[PDB]
Amino acid sequence: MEMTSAFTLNVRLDNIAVITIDVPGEKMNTLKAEFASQVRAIIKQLRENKELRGVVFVSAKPDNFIAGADINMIGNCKTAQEAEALARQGQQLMAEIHALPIQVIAAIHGACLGGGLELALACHGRVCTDDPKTVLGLPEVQLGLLPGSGGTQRLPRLIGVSTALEMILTGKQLRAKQALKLGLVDDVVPHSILLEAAVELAKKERPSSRPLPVRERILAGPLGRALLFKMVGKKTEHKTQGNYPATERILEVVETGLAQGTSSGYDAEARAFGELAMTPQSQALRSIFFASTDVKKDPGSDAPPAPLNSVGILGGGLMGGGIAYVTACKAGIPVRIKDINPQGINHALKYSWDQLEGKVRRRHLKASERDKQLALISGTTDYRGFAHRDLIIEAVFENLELKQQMVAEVEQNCAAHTIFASNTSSLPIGDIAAHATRPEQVIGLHFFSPVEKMPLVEIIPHAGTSAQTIATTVKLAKKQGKTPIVVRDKAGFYVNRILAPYINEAIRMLTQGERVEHIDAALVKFGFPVGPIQLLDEVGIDTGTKIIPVLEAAYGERFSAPANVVSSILNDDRKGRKNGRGFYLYGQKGRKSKKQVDPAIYPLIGTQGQGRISAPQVAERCVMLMLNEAVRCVDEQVIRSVRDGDIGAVFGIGFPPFLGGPFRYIDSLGAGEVVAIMQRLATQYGSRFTPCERLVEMGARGESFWKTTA
Amino acid sequence: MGQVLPLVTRQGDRIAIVSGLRTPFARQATAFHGIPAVDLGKMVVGELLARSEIPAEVIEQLVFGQVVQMPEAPNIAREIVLGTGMNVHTDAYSVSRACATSFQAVANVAESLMAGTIRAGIAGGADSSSVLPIGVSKKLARVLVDVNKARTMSQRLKLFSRLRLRDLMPVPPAVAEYSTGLRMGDTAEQMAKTYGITREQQDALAHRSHQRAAQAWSDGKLKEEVMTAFIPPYKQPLVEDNNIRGNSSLADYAKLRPAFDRKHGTVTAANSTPLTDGAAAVILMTESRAKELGLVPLGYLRSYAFTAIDVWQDMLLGPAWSTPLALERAGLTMSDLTLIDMHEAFAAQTLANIQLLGSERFAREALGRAHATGEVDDSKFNVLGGSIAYGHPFAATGARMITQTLHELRRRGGGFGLVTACAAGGLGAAMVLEAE
Amino acid sequence: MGQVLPLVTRQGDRIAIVSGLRTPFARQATAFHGIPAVDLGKMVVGELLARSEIPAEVIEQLVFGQVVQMPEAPNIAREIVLGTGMNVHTDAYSVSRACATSFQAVANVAESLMAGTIRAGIAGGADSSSVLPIGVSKKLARVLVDVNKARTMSQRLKLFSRLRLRDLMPVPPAVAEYSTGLRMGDTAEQMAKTYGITREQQDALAHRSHQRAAQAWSDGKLKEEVMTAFIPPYKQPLVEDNNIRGNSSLADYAKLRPAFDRKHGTVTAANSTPLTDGAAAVILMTESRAKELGLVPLGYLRSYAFTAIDVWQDMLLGPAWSTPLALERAGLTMSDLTLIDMHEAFAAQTLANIQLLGSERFAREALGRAHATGEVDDSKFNVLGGSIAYGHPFAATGARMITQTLHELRRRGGGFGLVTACAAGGLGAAMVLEAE
């Protein structure tokens, strides 16, 4: 009640006390500033009474045990001093909790993330339910930070060095069974007896009388700790490219904690919040986290949705199998596939089968539920059985008349309630609708290839589209574990529209006599996962390139690629991995190592010149193209909100997260200042680097797309 | 009404029959190899529900059964309900009556449904002769029970001391009758000898059955009754029955060794149905329930009958006994019966059956009825071929005949079909169908 | 509207239950060692006809089911007739529904002879845990089928090349659910943990049941419905149930380590039914037929109901769901129920069920009914003990419970008995008995 906080004490008839943690506001159980104060009062009031024999912590909330520290509290920090103050106060609070002689037990149910294991690692014993919602981990390196207290030193000394550093670096998740197997949690019980199952553990005499041994004692000591740190650091820096802070700092703080003692580790971790909380990467990651949470919260539309239980797919092959797998195995909705050929249905079912049972081969699932999941996918070559489908997806070739014919015939052979969606590539949605008895129930999705890897979709209404349709589609996309984005119906849409200049300028580079390897390495070192050419070949050369004529006919010739060279590869059976031959050595005869590109692509290219351009400069030019295209499209409100565009760009293309996205990057690089040097780029190469007019105005007068708070 | 009993419900509504379905049948090694018997039924039931407009909540009970039986999951109908997508509040149920299992399932569903307790149900059968349960010797089971109950270590060694001989070898399954030791085909050899069926009198029936079945696929008339099975390897789908061989000349398989007698064995392998794998199902529903949810009924049901005879000579005469009883219960006559059907598990036995229904003496003395039950025209008999062609999954060949017969009467535009079958143990079943 | 289902034939005669009888039960690997369940059924049905003094030609159908099915005789109801002295024209068949098969057998015999197709039938069940169908590994059987189909002599070696040391080992039988992997006990353990069942009160229930069963045997009240089995070695006859341990103390119960959950579980061997062998049977007959041939009916039948529930949580709440429907159909109330009898698969599930039929909230939301079913008085609950005493032969329990319930109601005024049972797969059955 604004003073009770959440931590409430209750002494039962036995000489034990149960502590409930019920936050009056959010359904999560987060950590705020006043808790660290009032819990001291509670623990003092408990320390006065000598009648007790044990204490237990209870979530008292169906959702989670403790969600984690409130990031907004960190957001108000101003320098290293405040962060060090928070670190030190958390350290002393956990030390005080660990300082009691009586038995302290944590009963874990729901979720325990971030600072949560802090409390768990500050307790002598802990038990967790078997509810498949329970999970343990440290999701703080993801936010460009490190755990609050002791987790870098008490956890390694509790469970081992290798697993602890793997948890701290990757920030993975723990299940109840595997936490028990590893040794983190002492016992696992069903939820019903949970608190009771803790009580007798409180009654046990030994707080710590015989710590469990480590079968991985071999490396204990200075004989191998240095070697392991060197190897893991080299591995990470090669994998993370060394542009991610709060990675080597983790190794340093763990080393100093293990070698010079726990006090040294505490001091090092206080300093770690001292700087790492203020590095620009930290603000970028916190901001992108906020954006993702907001878009998950956002309902897409404002009308109430409609019931959704039946999903149909018109087309098989490979992509239709992908939509089927996502809709069935993930969202758990029955899915019905229609095709003209039994071979297509068989091929789609084979794809869904192959995608699954890989968990079975890794014992992550068993056939008992594998069969149950497959039970939701049905196939047919006729229209009977579609009469009650709530929603349907069209995923076959993009001939406009063919799509019109199918939409007509499905209007004829289905219910009026049913809504239609199309996995359109380039054809306009309104044009596809055209002759529709119920055009208001026609919408367009846009997946990618494949659909179980890239995590966002596109929702593309036309002029007449009832808000119920948008709401239903957004809720469906959410239920599939994807991030929906609503965009304005314009030629080329948003994502591939800004992706096209990337590959275009990449080919323009390649033709002017530069080795592809070092430009690829430079551009992935800038922060982009996966290089240009491998992305281009595996994504589908024809599929992605098919829109280039559409973009050219829509806006201008800036999208135009060098002629007779890309099409030369196109009509050469060198069509990427699906054709088995393209760019990189696809034979994989080099002992499954990094096979170099095929020693025939260069001769077929003009490749006149030398490297010429600096390694940073090529990446700078490409990203400037994406930035100019992004600002140009957001000028005409192709994207509903700036946050939507930023999250789409960073989260579907692979924009460097530590840069935060396009607009964080704009505000970072002096804004309009870069325009100056960017203008120079045009004067070196051509009109393709003309500044966007909105960009000119904002930069010249001095502005940010994000007034917001600053 | 001294013999006729109507099959109406308490409210006065007849027992309508709605769609059915049939997995295409395969030999015991070609496809479905390693595929258990449960998941075939799972396939057919799941995709039968996902073919009509009925929500899954209408179905209130499903009955399957299987002859070849796996020790795990004895009540396979419950796993049919659980594994597929169905309401988990359906009263799953399993029966077993040898080769007439599907007929018994349909009869149970019909009588329970006309009792008033149910308004819609599923009845069918699945069978697989490729996952044979190969049990160990009987002696090497008491030893296992004792060693499970054995208390000290020294007792176990003294127990295995009696383990000797060839008790380790597995016991092959037996198709011979439990109480007779007759191989179910050698009870047809003596029937053929007794009623004088020539290897040329038969082996023309097999030819006329392979035809009118190859022709049936080629015409595609049986397109809407057969699924397109998809197999977990998903190498290639199975669309057509592979047992059918509607290309051989009648002078090609006249040169075959006798199977059982091997001395005077006027029956052989070609003119006898082979062991196969498959499944089939039918949706039973009262007329009122079908009407009130807007569904056209695929015919109806008129009457049925089951009969037993002594298993020591000619036990395969089940249809001969069952048919007159079914006719008298339906208030009909063999004359006014457009199209009939027979199980034809073997060449002969079926021919013997026609000869018997045509014989006045048999009905005079072995049944006590005044007159013989009538002869059957060739044209109105197994129009679309028979089990000497498709195959004989033990528990599935029931419902297949109902579906095919209803569709054929749909083409002829009326009539009263009739279906009969014989089973091991001297069990015979018959029922009369009415396609409006 | 009025939801009552009167079990009457077309003429209006209600269903009667003339007599019944039960083989005394035995522990696994004891006197009934090596005796196939078909032989137990033979024993009980033959001697039941012997006592019943009715002509064997009156019986027109029998239905036995059996769990732990043996592959040699699929339709054991036929061999029951063939091996005994019953008339061969008898039309027998088999069913199978978890641990409530006998309930289903009685149900469909009743509904069949209510339809008018027959006039008298026999329903029952038999099972034996003494003999097990222990089979070889799945991979091995495929090899055997292939080598049977193998055509080249040199191909057989290339086919046997694929082998393993662990493939020769026989596969032990499994009792856990096919689709869940949970044994019957694990569901009982989690149910006890959920609703809260202290070990002390479970052991109190077990002690009460054992004391009542021993008292009943010593009084000899269960003497006219138990055989005196004779075993082919013929060393000494079996007259009494050997499972009952009527000389026991609660202190002995308290000294048992938990079986499934070896950490916090509250079920052990003492408070759970063991593996037994036995058989039972009941003769159904319409009252007109009984009157015509001069028999006194041992009660009647009033209503029945079967229900399914989800398998993942609380699989053993069958009686709770089934009982209200049975009472509603019978037009009765739990208040006006002279005796109640419930199947005691485990102490925990029994206590949980009685707790639930008193739970107003449960019937208010889970069933949708307005009010709770009622309160189970301990005085009229399991008057003669229960399955925690005699045992669980799986199939025979329903027929057994019917026999003792009718006898006990006869020992008092008329009343209305009630019998319920849970079963694996979330199947529950209930029925109401009149006994005049």
In three-state form (DSSP H/G/I as H, E/B as E, the rest C), the secondary structure along A150-218 is: CCCCHHHHHHCHHHHHHHHHHCCCECHHHHHHHCCCCEEECCCCHHHHHHHHHHCCCCCCCCCCCCCHH
Q: What is the largest CA-CA distance in chain A?
A: 88
Handedness of CA A14, A19, A24, A28 (dihedral sign): negative
In a domain, A707, yes or no: no
Nearest CA in chain C to B329: C117
Q: A499 and A482 share a domain?
A: no
Measured between alpha carbons, how far is A317 from A302 in angstroms, rounded to an integer? Answer: 36
Q: Which residues of B are catalytic?
A: 99, 392, 422
Query: Resolution in angstroms, to 1 decimal, for this deposition?
Result: 3.5
Q: Are strands A125-129 and A187-189 parallel, antiparallel or unpaired?
A: parallel
In a domain, A65, yes or no: yes
Q: What is the largest CA-CA distance in chain B?
A: 77
Single residue among A492, A507, A534 that ends a domain in this structure: A492
Q: Do A193 and C264 touch (CB under 8 A)?
A: yes
Test the A interface: residue of C193, C262, C263, C312 with most A CBs within 10 Å: C193
Q: A390 and A431 share a domain?
A: yes
Structure tokens at C114: 């209510």
Q: A295 and A350 share a domain?
A: no
Q: What amino acid is encoded at B354 in this protein?
A: I
Test the B interface: residue of C14, C33, C68, C95 with most B CBs within 10 Å: C95
In a domain, A349, yes or no: yes
Handedness of CA A282, A283, A284, A289 (dihedral sign): positive
Token pair 């098989």 is found at A316
Handedness of CA C344, C346, C347, C351 (dihedral sign): negative
Q: Tell which residue, B392, B357, B402, has the closest CA to residue B123.
A: B402
Chain B, residues 54-93, CB within 8 A of chain C, namely: 67-69, 71-75, 78-79, 81-83, 88-93
Q: A144 and A181 share a domain?
A: yes
Q: A287 and A314 share a domain?
A: no
Q: A6 and A61 share a domain?
A: yes
- Residue C277: which H helix or E strand, with range? strand C276-286
Of C207, C210, C343, C422, catalytic: C422
Residues whose CB is less than 8 angstroms from the CB of residue A689 and which lie 6 or more positions away in sequence, other chains included: A621, A624, A625, A628, A678, A679, A681, A682
- The number of angstroms, rounded, from the C-alpha of B330 to the middle of its chain's C-alpha atoms is 22
Measured between alpha carbons, how far is A403 from A423 in angstroms, rounded to an integer? Answer: 11
Q: A544 and A679 share a domain?
A: yes
- The number of angstroms, rounded, from the C-alpha of C66 to the middle of its chain's C-alpha atoms is 10
Give the three-state DSSP class for C207. helix
Q: A606 and A673 share a domain?
A: yes
Token pair 């339906």 is found at B330
Q: Tell which residue, A52, A4, A5, has the closest CA to residue A29.
A: A5
Single residue among A458, A492, A526 that ends a domain in this structure: A492
- Phi and psi for A379 in degrees, rounded to 5? -135, 150
- Phi and psi for C126 in degrees, rounded to 5? -155, 140
Q: A415 and A537 share a domain?
A: no
Q: Tell which residue, B14, B257, B190, has the closest CA to residue B114.
A: B14
Q: Which residues of B touch A334 (CB under 8 A)?
A: 50, 85
In a domain, A292, yes or no: yes
Single residue among A292, A307, A322 that ends a domain in this structure: A307
User: Do the Cβ atoms of C98 and C309 come closer than 8 Å?
Assistant: no
Give the three-state DSSP class for A6. coil
Q: Are strands A103-108 and A54-58 parallel, antiparallel or unpaired?
A: parallel
Q: A501 and A411 share a domain?
A: no
Q: Are strands B427-434 and B303-308 parallel, antiparallel or unpaired?
A: antiparallel
Crossing angle of helices B153-160 and B139-149, in 10° steps, is 170
In a domain, A708, yes or no: no
- Structural domain including A357 reads 308-492
Report, in angstroms and rounded to the nearest whole number, the Rg of chain B calculated over CA atoms: 23
Measured between alpha carbons, how far is C419 from C319 in angstroms, rounded to an integer? Answer: 9
Handedness of CA A185, A186, A190, A195 (dihedral sign): negative
Q: Which chains touch C (3 or more CB pairs under 8 A)?
A: A, B
Give the C-alpha distances (Å, rounded to integers) separating B379 from B208, B249, B339, B340, B385. Answer: 11, 21, 8, 10, 11
Q: Which residues of A touch C179 (CB under 8 A)?
A: 368, 372
In a domain, A246, yes or no: yes
- Phi and psi for A691 in degrees, rounded to 5? -75, 145
User: Do the Cβ atoms of C388 and C253 come closer than 8 Å?
Assistant: no
Test the A interface: residue of C138, C182, C199, C264 with most A CBs within 10 Å: C264
Q: What amino acid is encoded at A34 in this protein?
A: E
User: Do the Cβ atoms of A19 and A202 come closer than 8 Å?
Assistant: no
Structural domain count of chain A: 3
Measured between alpha carbons, how far is A533 from A539 in angstroms, rounded to an integer? Answer: 10
Q: Which residues of B touch A353 (CB under 8 A)?
A: 232, 234
Measured between alpha carbons, how far is C8 from C15 in angstroms, rounded to an integer? Answer: 7
Q: Which residues of B touch C146 (CB under 8 A)?
A: 29
Query: Catalytic: C392?
Result: yes
In a domain, A261, yes or no: yes
In a domain, A710, yes or no: no
Give the three-state DSSP class for A406. helix
Query: In the beta sheet, which residues pair with residue C226?
Result: C22
Q: Which chains touch B (3 or more CB pairs under 8 A)?
A: A, C
Q: What is the distance in angstroms between the Cα of B237 and the nearest Cα belonging to chain A?
A: 7
Q: Tell which residue, A138, A103, A139, has the closest CA to residue A123.
A: A103
Give the C-alpha distances (Å, rounded to integers) separating A96 from A9, A44, A153, A553. Answer: 17, 10, 17, 70
Q: A72 and A204 share a domain?
A: yes
Number of Cβ atoms within 10 Å of the Cβ of B429: 30
Measured between alpha carbons, how far is C261 from A130 in angstroms, rounded to an integer? Answer: 14
What do you get for the CA distance between the two ends of chain B, in Å? 22
Q: Catalogue the long-range contacts made by A551-559 (C-beta closer than 8 Å, 24 or more residues apart).
A: A551/A491, A551/A492, A551/A497, A551/A500, A553/A491, A554/A490, A554/A491, A554/A492, A555/A491, A555/A492, A558/A501, A558/A687, A558/A688, A559/A500, A559/A501, A559/A504
Residues whose CB is less than 8 angstroms from the CB of residue B406 and which lie 6 or more positions away in sequence, other chains included: B17, B20, B298, B299, B417, B433, B435
Q: A530 and A498 share a domain?
A: yes
